[PDB]
Amino acid sequence: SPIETVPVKLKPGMDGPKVKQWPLTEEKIKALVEICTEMEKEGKISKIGPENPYNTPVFAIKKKDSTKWRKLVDFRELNKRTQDFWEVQLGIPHPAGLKQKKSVTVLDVGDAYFSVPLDKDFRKYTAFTIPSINNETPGIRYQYNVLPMGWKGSPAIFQSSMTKILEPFRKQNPDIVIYQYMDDLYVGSDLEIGQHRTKIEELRQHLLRWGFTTPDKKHQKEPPFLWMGYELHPDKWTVQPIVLPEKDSWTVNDIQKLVGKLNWASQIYAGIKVRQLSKLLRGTKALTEVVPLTEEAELELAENREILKEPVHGVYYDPSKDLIAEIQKQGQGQWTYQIYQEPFKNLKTGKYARMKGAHTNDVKQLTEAVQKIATESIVIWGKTPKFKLPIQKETWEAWWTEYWQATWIPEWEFVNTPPLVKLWYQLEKEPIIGAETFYVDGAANRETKLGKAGYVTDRGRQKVVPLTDTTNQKTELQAIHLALQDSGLEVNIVTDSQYALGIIQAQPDKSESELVSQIIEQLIKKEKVYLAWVPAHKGIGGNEQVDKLVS
Amino acid sequence: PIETVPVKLKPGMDGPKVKQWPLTEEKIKALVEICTEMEKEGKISKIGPENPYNTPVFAIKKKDSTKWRKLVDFRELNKRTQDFWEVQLGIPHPAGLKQKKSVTVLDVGDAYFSVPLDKDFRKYTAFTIPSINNETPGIRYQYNVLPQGWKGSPAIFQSSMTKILEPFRKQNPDIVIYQYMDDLYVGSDLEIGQHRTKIEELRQHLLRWGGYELHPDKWTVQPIVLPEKDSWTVNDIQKLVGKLNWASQIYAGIKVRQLSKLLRGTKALTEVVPLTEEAELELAENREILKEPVHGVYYDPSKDLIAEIQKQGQGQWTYQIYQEPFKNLKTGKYARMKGAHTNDVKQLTEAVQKIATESIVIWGKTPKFKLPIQKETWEAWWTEYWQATWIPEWEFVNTPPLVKLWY
Ligand SMILES: Nc1nc2c(ncn2[C@H]2C[C@H](O)[C@@H](COP(=O)(O)OP(=O)(O)OP(=O)(O)O)O2)c(=O)[nH]1
Ligand SMILES: OC[C@H]1O[C@@](CO)(O[C@H]2O[C@H](CO)[C@@H](O)[C@H](O)[C@H]2O)[C@@H](O)[C@@H]1O
Ligand SMILES: [Mg+2]
Numbered sequence: 001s002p003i004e005t006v007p008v009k010l011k012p013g014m015d016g017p018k019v020k021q022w023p024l025t026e027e028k029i030k031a032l033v034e035i036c037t038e039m040e041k042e043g044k045i046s047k048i049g050p051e052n053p054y055n056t057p058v059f060a061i062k063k064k065d066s067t068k069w070r071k072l073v074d075f076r077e078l079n080k081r082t083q084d085f086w087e088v089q090l091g092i093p094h095p096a097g098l099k100q101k102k103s104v105t106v107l108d109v110g111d112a113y114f115s116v117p118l119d120k121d122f123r124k125y126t127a128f129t130i131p132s133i134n135n136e137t138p139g140i141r142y143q144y145n146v147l148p149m150g151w152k153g154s155p156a157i158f159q160s161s162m163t164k165i166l167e168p169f170r171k172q173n174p175d176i177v178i179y180q181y182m183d184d185l186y187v188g189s190d191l192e193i194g195q196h197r198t199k200i201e202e203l204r205q206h207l208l209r210w211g212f213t214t215p216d217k218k219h220q221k222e223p224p225f226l227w228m229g230y231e232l233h234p235d236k237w238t239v240q241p242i243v244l245p246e247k248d249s250w251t252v253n254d255i256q257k258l259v260g261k262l263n264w265a266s267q268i269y270a271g272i273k274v275r276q277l278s279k280l281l282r283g284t285k286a287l288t289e290v291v292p293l294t295e296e297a298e299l300e301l302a303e304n305r306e307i308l309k310e311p312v313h314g315v316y317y318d319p320s321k322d323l324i325a326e327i328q329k330q331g332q333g334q335w336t337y338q339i340y341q342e343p344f345k346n347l348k349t350g351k352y353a354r355m356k357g358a359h360t361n362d363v364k365q366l367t368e369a370v371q372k373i374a375t376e377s378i379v380i381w382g383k384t385p386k387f388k389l390p391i392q393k394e395t396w397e398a399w400w401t402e403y404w405q406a407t408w409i410p411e412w413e414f415v416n417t418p419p420l421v422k423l424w425y426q427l428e429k430e431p432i433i434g435a436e437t438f439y440v441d442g443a444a445n446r447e448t449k450l451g452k453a454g455y456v457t458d459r460g461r462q463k464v465v466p467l468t469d470t471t472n473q474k475t476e477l478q479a480i481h482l483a484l485q486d487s488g489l490e491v492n493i494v495t496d497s498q499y500a501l502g503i504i505q506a507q508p509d510k511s512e513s514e515l516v517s518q519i520i521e522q523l524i525k526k527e528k529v530y531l532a533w534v535p536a537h538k539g540i541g542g543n544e545q546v547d548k549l550v551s
Numbered sequence: 552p553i554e555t556v557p558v559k560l561k562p563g564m565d566g567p568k569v570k571q572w573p574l575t576e577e578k579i580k581a582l583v584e585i586c587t588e589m590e591k592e593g594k595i596s597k598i599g600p601e602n603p604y605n606t607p608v609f610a611i612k613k614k615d616s617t618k619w620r621k622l623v624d625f626r627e628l629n630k631r632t633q634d635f636w637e638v639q640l641g642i643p644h645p646a647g648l649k650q651k652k653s654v655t656v657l658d659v660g661d662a663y664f665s666v667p668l669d670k671d672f673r674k675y676t677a678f679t680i681p682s683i684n685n686e687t688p689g690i691r692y693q694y695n696v697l698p699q700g701w702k703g704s705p706a707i708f709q710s711s712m713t714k715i716l717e718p719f720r721k722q723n724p725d726i727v728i729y730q731y732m733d734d735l736y737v738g739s740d741l742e743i744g745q746h747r748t749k750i751e752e753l754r755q756h757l758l759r760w761g762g763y764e765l766h767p768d769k770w771t772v773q774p775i776v777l778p779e780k781d782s783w784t785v786n787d788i789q790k791l792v793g794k795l796n797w798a799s800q801i802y803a804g805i806k807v808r809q810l811s812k813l814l815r816g817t818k819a820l821t822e823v824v825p826l827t828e829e830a831e832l833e834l835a836e837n838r839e840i841l842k843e844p845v846h847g848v849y850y851d852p853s854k855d856l857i858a859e860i861q862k863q864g865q866g867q868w869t870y871q872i873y874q875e876p877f878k879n880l881k882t883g884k885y886a887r888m889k890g891a892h893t894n895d896v897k898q899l900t901e902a903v904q905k906i907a908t909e910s911i912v913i914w915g916k917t918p919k920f921k922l923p924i925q926k927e928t929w930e931a932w933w934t935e936y937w938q939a940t941w942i943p944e945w946e947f948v949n950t951p952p953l954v955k956l957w958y
Contacts, residue, residue, distance in 0.1 A: 084603035088688035097684030156600035382576030382683040406895035406924045431820035458819045542817035
């Protein structure tokens with residue numbers, strides 16, 4: 001290609017790589033004098049000599065052609081010594097973001113990286129040695145004149161070059177959509193097939209002038225088109241077949257593979273869950289460690305298989321219609337969603353199941369799912385959808401009025417798909433008449449690891465419980481636990497733990513802490529609870545009595 | 552055709568490397584047309600990936616000006632850029648701005664587009680326009696000119712700006728002009744109509760060489776208030792004692808011993824307690840101490856400003872601006888008037904813009920905000936409501952209300 005090279009440098013103070021080749025067989029090094037001779041004839045590489053002090057090992061894998069080989073160079077050292085780049089690939093195109101087109105073509109560039117020249121001054125650093133005769137002779141060595149596969153600068157420089165080469169055609173044909181992912185070009189248009197093929201031929205000639213071939217073997221003309229791991233039909237798109245592993249004995253690595261495949265499937269298969277399977281990965285120590293599936297993990301896997309054996313498809317985007325995102329709750333902090341425009345015709349699906357923070361509730365997690373969907377929708381379609389959420393307007397209103405942090409959800413309507421999202425309790429804003437008043441306190445000794453938790457009440461009741469292997473905050477939470485345990489359906493509670501008040505006042509319904517979980521249980525079972533704070537060690541009311549009692 | 556000023560980063564610091572966040576269709580289209588026109592006019596140049604730096608870019612739309620305005624978030628670059636109080640190119644802030652009856656803000660960033668930028672610094676100004684559904688890789692540009700939002704632009708353009716404002720400030724000695732980043736804050740004491748008229752004349756002068764209305768007189772301070780009742784419960788006195796106990800960290804000579812003495816014994820929260828003569832004495836005294844401003848708190852221009860905000864509900868937001876803890880330079884209460892009353896994130900964003908604006912008028916710089924919001928909630932929506940050409944520093948906090956001090 002006559003494209004102008006891109007100047008690249010090594011990091012300051014750094015020099016080139018000086019490593020050695022592997023394994024030196026006459027089959028291997030005769031294959032290495034076999035592969036390169038054609039690249040040298042075409043000008044991709046050039047022979048070099050001992051006055052070049054650098055070296056890097058080379059190898060090759062098999063392409064998905066399964067007959068052609070792919071030449072790779074282990075440039076990890078050179079990459080470590082090469083300047084940083086700003087990557088221009090910001091994300092991955094999705095078929096749900098495509099619009100229906102009358103005529104579609106998919107093209108691939110042949111030997112893409114090898115068609116882009118490398119900066120002259122940099123070429124000396126790409127030197128690779130092939131032993132002449134198993135180290136019995138100086139040795140044959142080459143250097144790259146084009147972008148190597150394995151150098152960290154090659155993909156960005158190729159992408160930039162391809163963008164510059166495509167820009168004229170894009171500006172001249174605004175009514176032709178060209179999705180450009182590496183050397184893979186999707187080309188859609190609303191032209192009749194004849195003039196469409198005319199414009200395709202023009203595009204291929206433009207690419208060829210700049211040295212980018214488009215072999216017919218990788219030129220798709222009729223549906224279904226194979227594109228980015230999907231199959232594109234005129235009216236719908238499908239994922240390419242997903243094959244789940246089937247094992248009698250499962251290792252950590254097998255489960256990791258399975259969860260990954262299920263996540264990939266969740267983009268179009270509705271209702272996928274991976275919580276129980278992922279829990280098996282926790283606490284493990286080796287990738288080859290055998291992990292027996294729990295009962296819950298077996299059930300979750302079976303449900304996923306049932307989902308996956310049913311055929312599904314997504315549809316394409318209609319910009320003259322609204323985007324709609326509907327969310328359902330699945331339990332244990334798992335959420336699934338569908339994005340569509342016409343009912344029962346999903347553009348795509350997805351799921352949200354991250355645990356953010358030690359203590360949270362379903363309203364916060366629903367807000368998080370809404371935010372994930374909003375970001376994804378802006379990426380794919382450039383706008384935010386309208387939401388259908390299983391939460392009452394009264395519940396949301398109560399939450400965002402009582403909660404102290406600013407929060408919001410865009411335009412949404414209530415959809416009655418149980419289980420609904422709800423607040424599981426609400427602390428009273430005023431003290432409760434006729435309810436017992438508990439002054440609670442807990443304290444721990446940091447060097448000793450011993451503590452105590454207790455309460456004093458206005459009705460004359462008092463209690464102190466010893467605690468071992470605890471902390472300060474844990475003793476405070478423990479005092480609240482005692483008060484909730486020994487009180488009736490309605491209770492007033494007074495603590496000096498800004499920490500515990502902080503956790504409980506956020507109305508969490510789940511927690512990574514067993515103690516906080518127990519407190520949540522007790523709060524859900526209560527009828528009315530007023531919780532108040534006072535400063536400690538100021539000799540206040542019953543707080544001084546309980547603080548004296550614990551000590 | 553002017554010689555550039557050599558500028559460098561602070562020692563041991565590298566350029567910004569901040570990722571571009573997703574943008575809606577309208578913002579992307581606006582940025583594409585704006586950057587295309589700027590590219591034809593030579594203000595920016597297309598660059599490749601061998602430039603390893605990046606700064607996020609987006610666009611805003613003022614309500615009174617339906618044209619899109621490009622906004623590059625150069626906060627990181629500004630933090631890494633050399634200071635200009637060593638090159639003596641700093642801007643002094645006039646103390647008379649906050650006394651004026653009306654202050655209009657004007658966007659004068661376009662002036663910066665007439666002065667070239669140091670050839671060896673331009674690489675630090677790179678930014679990337681994204682693509683809907685990642686149809687294409689991002690499109691990268693860098694500045695050849697003093698960029699909008701870069702802290703070095705007002706410093707380098709200072710001499711020019713003074714030369715352009717000299718006749719207007721000569722014909723109007725009692726109007727105050729203060730330049731902050733890309734903005735001119737223009738204060739006067741005269742009536743509304745003639746104020747807007749003189750603003751028009753100022754505009755035509757600037758336009759010839761190359762309307763947001765504030766009222767600082769209406770900015771009041773909201774102090775710590777104590778409730779006033781006739782009968783008091785145990786709970787009322789517990790909350791009062793806790794509130795005053797916190798307030799003893801800010802004010803001087805605040806007592807609690809008698810009001811606290813009322814609570815002796817393990818008493819029911821709802822039980823009514825009569826106020827001792829001595830306790831009423833204590834409440835009146837403490838109530839008076841909170842009435843007058845705290846003595847001994849002065850602005851220090853060598854230290855940064857910090858702003859805390861608390862949501863109070865029903866569209867009310869309290870805030871405090873300080874430099875050292877508990878030594879508040881200002882306490883206030885923001886309230887929206889849009890009528891809709893149903894968006895916390897919008898109200899908080901507007902509150903940040905108003906507080907930072909007051910900090911610019913009063914002290915000449917914005918404070919670092921401690922925002923009572925989750926990071927991801929703020930980042931999901933805040934650009935939809937931003938209207939300023941500057942962006943303040945902020946961080947995210949989650950502190951529930953122990954006592955409700957400021958309400
Ligand atoms: N270092 C490295 N680069 C890859 C790999 N797979 C693809 N690429 C890069 C280099 C390729 O030139 C470019 C386009 O991928 P292709 O599958 O089309 O390979 P290529 O165009 O070189 O040969 P082709 O004529 O299409 O069979 O993307 C890989 O596994 N390792
Ligand atoms: O909202 C914070 C978020 O913004 C980023 C860039 O998007 O950093 C910007 O905001 C920070 C907070 O003031 C600044 O410190 C920084 O200089 C500015 O670029 C992210 O770093 C951060 O997650
Ligand atoms: Mg190819």
